[PDB]
């Protein structure tokens, strides 16, 4: 689901891709994302991620 997104002032101002482990899916594109913010800032229409080691 469309969980906590960076959609605010300090947009995906987080690169350090070496920590998080979200579970994002988009119609038919399910993959994990570290920079969950980079997703929220650079997603199509609101990537569907679910924070947690599920993917």
Swiss-Prot record:
Residues 1-55 form the Kazal-like domain. PROSITE patterns: KAZAL_2. It comes from the Eukaryota. It is found in: Secreted. InterPro entries: Kazal_dom, Kazal_dom_sf. This is Trypsin inhibitor. Its main location: secreted. The record marks 16-17 as: Reactive bond.
